[PDB]
């Protein structure tokens, strides 16, 4: 008759219940949302309250209650839940809802060793006072629950033992800004910090996880992926391996080119025993890749590339096929099969494909990537020469074998090596592109190492970022954003540390960046286009010309200011060649949109003052970044309207952006009748992209007689992709609802 319910506080222990405090907080969180029942939430959580429960559990419980009502039909629960979680997270880090002033926060964090001390060196208290005036902690209210789950899970600075969270998303953004523009002239430094801060807090520009979790802290390791090229020698094999180990110990995705390793049977090169072949070494790279992961299998990912005509290609192609002898399988690494014009022509004419160990055909490997003419000449030449060890395979058998394996595992990727060299930012004769990275979006020059510390080797890196096509109003907002993206990344290049000499060489030499988009799908839904009918062709053309033009304008602008990258002379850019001059011709047949930009003015501006960065665009996939922004992933159509994630904290649901008004506008992944629509769009994007795009092929067995995908369809799609100049092909998904 005074039946209370004692809440317990952070060692302040006992106290009565405050069900009106709670309601106030809920009420607040609900402000502006539509279709959310505060009572419903209260009922669901009050029922699990027990007499001496700590306050932190009252919050988790109201948070989960809200999260569990998220649905297609009631999507504002995602904000109600996030807002509660944000509120809780404030109290958890600061003891109040109101964040401490920035200077005080930074000072306390530097004493605690959670923020780099250089922050206080590079900026004055008055400078921090001013940044604080740019900050808007109410943007914390725009995150969706899944977004807060990710920030909380892997962005915000915290203690991973105790669980203690030390910061709010706005301090993350403001300090990422500050660190990246810390070396700017006092004259412009803070205007840049503010402009970027705004761009990232309002989700216009997304940034990779290592960057958002680390810049501001004492580390200097921000690598997401590297590209190493193995020479045909124990020294290189050793170096390659060494390099992989250092790089996976920093969580980087690895893309390895082991195409030149000579084939099984070849003669000993004075002490180097490659009699045994590629596989034993591949195994060795796999163990290197997995050296710093959980069981010896969990975590650490790589993709290994090799020419289609390699002598052991038929053994290589079935490396992840589970039914087979243990010794002849390297299952936990994806492969990237490298193909060019001549290979496909042999398929089309039903002729043979000749396998050869690279060791035995002088000049063939290089020609393969850099000069098709010459490749054709040496190829036919060596076919005829009977001194040369070789093997003949029916091109149809070889192609189907590879498509088959690509079909089953989903992880046998294609790389059109002529397309990456005839349509690239680089000169193939001096710095050809002979491999991709883990997710087949990166395409840069690499040189083999002779020792881990070899200064004449080159390792390519992933320096990434992305435009939210869902958060810009017109494409002319991309000029400001290109500036801010390019400048921040370029700064990062000098900010971070390089574990291997050859990886420093590549970054400082070519300053290569890979900026792409996210939210494509939602962008097309708001403009009433679809992926599979070809209705989005000109819009895509318009959107990717604007992205590329402004990126080049921003980089050109930057070279003016601070000088072109040291090896700018090895680019086609240097010679007055533009992406619009070398794209694959057939594109002309599927899109008429005219260039809206002065490419000729920029051509000269580029020839004259050069480019800060040798590459600027690359369309990578993005789960995390996309989630924080509540956006569809990179350029992929959504699988369905609500996507589910698991957690220790219950089921996380996230509804596609503006489902309310665009459910009929979206074209879900399995609603596309086939791949042509999408492959065209990828081809159009590739006109302007410097690097590559992680494109997927998707098949639904329901759509085929007897539930079997014809090898004909698989080859036709493959050839469709090559015909519209697609550089790479990534995942292949099979199924009809996920």
């Amino acid at each position: 008759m005074n039946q209370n319910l004692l809440v317990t506080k952070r060692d302040g222990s006992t106290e009565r219940i405050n069900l009106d405090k709670i309601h106030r907080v809920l009420d607040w969180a609900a402000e502006g949302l539509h279709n959310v029942s505060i009572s419903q939430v209260e009922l669901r959580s009050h029922i699990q309250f027990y007499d001496g429960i700590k306050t932190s559990d009252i919050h988790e419980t109201i948070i989960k209650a809200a999260a569990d009502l998220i649905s297609r039909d009631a999507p504002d629960y995602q904000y109600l839940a996030a807002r509660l979680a944000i509120f809780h997270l404030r109290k958890k880090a600061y003891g109040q809802f109101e964040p401490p002033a920035l200077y005080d926060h930074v000072v306390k964090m530097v004493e605690m060793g959670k923020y780099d001390n250089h922050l206080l060196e590079d900026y004055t208290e008055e400078e921090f006072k001013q940044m604080d005036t740019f900050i808007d902690h109410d943007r914390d209210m725009t995150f969706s629950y899944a977004a807060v789950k990710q920030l909380e899970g892997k962005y915000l600075v915290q203690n991973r033992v105790t669980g203690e969270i030390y910061e709010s998303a706005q301090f993350l953004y403001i300090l990422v800004a500050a660190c990246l523009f810390s070396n700017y002239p006092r004259e412009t430094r803070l205007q840049y910090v503010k402009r970027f801060y705004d761009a990232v807090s309002t989700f216009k520009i997304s940034l990779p996880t290592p960057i958002m979790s680390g810049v501001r802290t004492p580390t200097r390791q921000f690598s997401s992926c590297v590209l190493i090229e193995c020479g045909d020698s124990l020294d290189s094999i050793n170096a390659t391996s060494s390099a992989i180990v250092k790089y996976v110990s920093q969580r980087a995705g690895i893309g390895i080119n082991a195409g030149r390793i000579r084939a099984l049977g070849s003669p000993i090169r004075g002490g180097e025993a490659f009699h045994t072949g590629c596989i034993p070494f591949y195994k060795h790279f796999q163990t290197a890749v997995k050296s710093c992961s959980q069981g010896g299998v969990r975590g650490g990912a790589a993709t290994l590339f090799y020419p289609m005509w390699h002598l052991e290609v038929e053994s290589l192609l079935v490396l992840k096929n589970n039914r087979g002898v243990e010794g002849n399988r390297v299952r936990h690494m994806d492969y990237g099969v490298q193909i060019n014009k001549l290979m496909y022509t042999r398929l089309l004419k039903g002729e043979d494909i000749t396998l050869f160990s690279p060791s035995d055909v002088p000049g063939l490997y290089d020609a393969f990537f850099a000069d098709q003419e010459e490749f054709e000449r040496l190829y036919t030449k060596y076919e005829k020469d009977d001194s040369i060890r070789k093997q003949r395979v029916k091109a149809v058998e070889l192609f189907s074998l590879m498509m088959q394996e690509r079909a089953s595992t989903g992880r046998i990727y294609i790389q059109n090596v002529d397309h990456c060299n005839t349509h690239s930012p680089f000169d193939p004769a001096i710095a050809p592109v002979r491999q991709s990275n883990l997710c087949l979006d990166i395409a840069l020059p690499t040189k083999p190492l002779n020792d881990v510390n070899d200064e004449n080797g080159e390792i390519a890196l992933c320096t990434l970022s992305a435009f939210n096509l869902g958060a810009i109003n017109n494409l002319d907002e991309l000029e400001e954003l290109a500036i801010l993206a390019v400048r921040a990344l370029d700064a990062l290049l000098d900010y971070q540390d390089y574990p291997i000499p050859a990886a420093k060489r590549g970054a400082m030499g070519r300053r290569t960046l890979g900026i792409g988009v996210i939210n494509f799908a939602y962008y097309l839904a708001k403009h009433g286009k679809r992926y599979s009918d070809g209705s989005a062709n000109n819009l895509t053309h318009k959107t990717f010309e604007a992205i590329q033009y402004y990126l080049l304008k921003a980089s050109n602008e930057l070279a003016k200011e601070q000088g072109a990258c040291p090896w700018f002379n090895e680019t086609t850019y240097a010679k007055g060649i533009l992406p619009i001059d070398t794209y694959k011709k057939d594109l002309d047949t599927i899109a008429n949109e005219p260039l809206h930009y002065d490419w000729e003015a920029l051509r000269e501006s580029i020839k004259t003052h050069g480019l800060r960065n040798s590459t600027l665009s690359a369309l990578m996939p993005s789960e995390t970044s996309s989630q924080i922004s509540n956006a569809t992933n990179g350029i992929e159509p959504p699988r369905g309207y609500v996507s589910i994630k698991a957690s220790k904290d219950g089921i996380l649901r996230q509804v596609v952006p503006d489902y309310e008004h665009l459910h009929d506008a979206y074209e879900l992944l399995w609603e596309m009748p086939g791949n042509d629509g999408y492959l065209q769009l990828v081809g159009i994007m590739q006109k302007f992209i410097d690097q590559s795009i992680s494109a997927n092929t998707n098949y639904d067995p329901s759509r085929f007689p007897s539930g079997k995908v014809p090898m004909q369809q698989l080859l036709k799609d493959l050839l469709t992709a090559y015909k519209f100049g697609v550089k790479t092909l990534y995942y292949q998904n099979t199924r009809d609802g996920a």
């Binding site: 070279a559 000088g563 072109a564 003052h609 050069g610």
Partner: peptide, 4 residues
């Protein structure tokens, strides 16, 4: 500019 352009390096030198």
């Amino acid at each position: 500019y352009l390096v030198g």
